[PDB]
């Protein structure tokens with residue numbers, strides 16, 4: 001689920017960054033590797049911020065709200081990295097938001113691909129499962145990507161770990177497709193990022 005709005009797309013795919021204070025050297029290196037991981041497979045580029053007006057700030061802060069999708073413009077935008085959301089794959093997910101990706105399970109067509117088990121959602125967190133409105137999103141021809149780094153796990157915001165909130169609707173290669181990986185960018189994440197930033201083939 002890529003943003004459909006041209007203004008949230010970072011010009012030339014160049015995203016300047018600041019790493020804020022209070023992080024360990026170790027944590028700082030993981031941020032660098034996460035940005036690099038985006039660069040290895042796409043034409044998106046992360047540059048140390050010199051005098052750019054719009055840029056991202058890795059901010060030492062409790063995990064949660066909110067990661068702006070794409071380029072907000074007219075100033076810095078913060079990425080909240082705390083104790084429990086500082087691992088490489090989580091950072092790659094957050095940088096997914098930064099480059100212009102919503103959560104995959106909120107695609108306007110998601111109901112053809114997953115069931116949402118409402119009764120299992122933590123009360124007050126159901127808004128996290130609302131479909132994006134169709135004007136806000138573009139698929140760019142990409143199929144629903146169960147493997148996306150932007151896809152929720154089976155039990156995200158569940159009342160308990162053994163209760164599913166998201167259940168894929170069909171089998172892929174004889175098997176119910178696994179969801180919620182935070183290891184690397186999927187084939188789909190790369191293909192969709194390349195399309196959104198018009199990366200040379």
Ligand SMILES: CCCCC[C@H](CC(=O)NO)C(=O)N1[C@@H]2CC[C@@H](C2)[C@H]1C(=O)N[C@H](C(=O)O)c1ccccc1
Nearest residue numbers: 064065066067068069070093094097101102103125128
């Ligand atoms: C229980 C609290 C829920 C936190 C919201 C979510 C956190 C996330 O996904 N982190 O990786 C988020 O920040 N979101 C949702 C997923 C992508 C969008 C929606 C992002 C969000 O709220 N974006 C806003 C926007 O881009 O319009 C926004 C972010 C920051 C400031 C203002 C608006």
Ligand SMILES: [Zn+2]
Nearest residue numbers: 093094097103
């Ligand atoms: Zn997210």
Ligand SMILES: [Zn+2]
Nearest residue numbers: 145148188189
């Ligand atoms: Zn994808």
